[PDB]
Every structure is written in C-alpha cells, then in structure tokens.
Amino acid sequence: LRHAIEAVPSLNNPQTFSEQKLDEALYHGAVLRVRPKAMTVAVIIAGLLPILWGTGAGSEVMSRIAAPMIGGMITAPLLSLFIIPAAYKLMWLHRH
Amino acid sequence: WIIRRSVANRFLVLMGALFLSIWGTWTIINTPVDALPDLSD
C-alpha cells in the first residue's frame, strides 16, 4: 500500500485530491497482496498443521504450542486484509 | 544494501552451501537424543 501511494499515482495524490485515484491505487496493492499473501498464509498454516494433530509422544505439548498460531493465522490475515487498508486510506486523509 | 554485494559472490556461495549442506548433514546424523531437555534443578 505504501509504494502504491509512492509510485506514479502518488504524484497525483499528494498533489491533488482524488479518492477515486487512491482507491484505484489500493485495489492493485490489493490484488498484488493476494498472490504472495494467500500463499504466505497457506504455507504458514499448512506447515503448522501437522503438529496440531496430536497422536504420538510429545504431540501434547507441540499441539498446544501450535493451535494459538494456527488459529491466530486465520484472523490475522483475514482481518488485516481489510483493517490495514481501511485505516491507511483513512490516515492518509488527515495529513490531507 | 547487502542484496547488491551478494550477487557478486555467485559461485563460491554455492560451494559454501555445498559443503555447509554436507556439513550440516554430517552433524545431524551424529547428534545426541533425549525425550526432553533436562528440566531438573
């Protein structure tokens, strides 16, 4: 989001106001997050999932140390996808 | 910064990780084992 508002569309934004121009700038930093993001979230949870299953010696403690991360990796990404943008479009309007 | 100086070390970096790979593989094969770390006072 920062480099979207630091590229060539960021010549228009700091110069003059066009919410429809900064929105378009957030929609690409939006589709460009999905590819690396949806995978980052997938690789974190997919690789963290085996230990969540608790059959075997030592599973008990590792599955307890895991759940918080796996659970926290559903709401962290899911939410931060909408919380970061809607707070950066809103904080960019104050200075402006 | 460092992403610049790195590309130059193109060749030997590979061999460093070549020996490192066979070095880290030798140790793992020869590492002691236990159920848990010693937790006693």
């Binding site: 974190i44 230990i51 590792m62 809607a86 | 460092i2 790195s6 590979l14 937790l39």
Partner: protein, 139 residues
C-alpha cells in the same frame, strides 16, 4: 525447528513472487523472443529491490519479538529454552540465506477466482471504512 518451517519458506516465496510479476512486466514492455543471461539477471535482482527490506526485517522481527521468552526461569525456562533457540537459529539461517543464496538460486533456476470473492468485499470496505474499523473492534 518444526514450528519454524512455515516461516523459512515464507522468506523465499514472497521474494520469488514479486519477481514472477516483475518478469511479466518486462515481457509486456519489451519483445518476447529476445533475452540474454544478463537480461534475465536484472529483472530478478530488481524484485529484491522492493521487498528485500520488508521481509528480512520481518524475519528479524519474528526472531526478536520472541527473545523475551528466554526470560522464563527454572523448569519452564529449561523446557521452552531449546525450542526458542532453534526457532531463532532456524529463522536466522533462512533469513541470512535469503540474502546470500535464495535470490541467486531463483535467477539460476485459479488465483482469479479467489480474487473475485475478495474485492467485492474489499471495495465494500471503503464504505465509511470507519464502520469496518468499528466491526473489527467488536471482534
């Protein structure tokens, strides 16, 4: 090392991914049947230009925001001691390797349909987005 594996591969991929689209822009701005071993060199190392800091400092974050764990005293500190150590060394390795080898090895060697489920709600989030920061608060 087990808990950490999900993040080491995370170091390389976000870097490789920005390169996959940076190599798809040179393809549209330039010809498509002409390219050398150096012309393929510059496009990938230019993917390390942007996210380079973002990730290495993010792994630097993941290994430091964990350090406080080492302050656990006695029996508990002896249990989760070695786990903290290796979770840290594993990252430090993946991090120091995504700057010495990873960028090198990547130059030497239905997304649409999830994108269609997302942006309808994203463009929606820009409706009095404050109302979406309010809904996050109740969570």
């Amino acid at each position: 090392i087990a808990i950490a594996v999900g993040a080491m591969v995370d170091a390389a991929i976000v870097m490789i991914e920005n390169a996959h689209k940076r190599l798809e822009e040179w393809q549209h701005q330039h010809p498509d049947a002409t390219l050398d071993n150096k012309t393929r060199w510059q496009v990938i190392t230019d993917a390390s230009v942007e996210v380079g800091p973002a990730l290495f400092i993010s792994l630097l974050i993941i290994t430091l925001s964990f350090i406080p764990i080492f302050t656990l005293e006695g029996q508990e500190g002896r249990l989760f001691g070695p786990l903290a150590f290796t979770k840290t060394y594993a990252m430090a390795g993946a991090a120091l390797l995504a700057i010495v080898v990873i960028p090198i090895l990547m130059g030497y060697w239905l997304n649409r349909f999830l994108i269609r489920v997302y942006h309808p709600l994203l463009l929606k989030v820009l409706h009095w987005p404050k109302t979406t920061l309010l809904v996050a608060a109740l969570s």
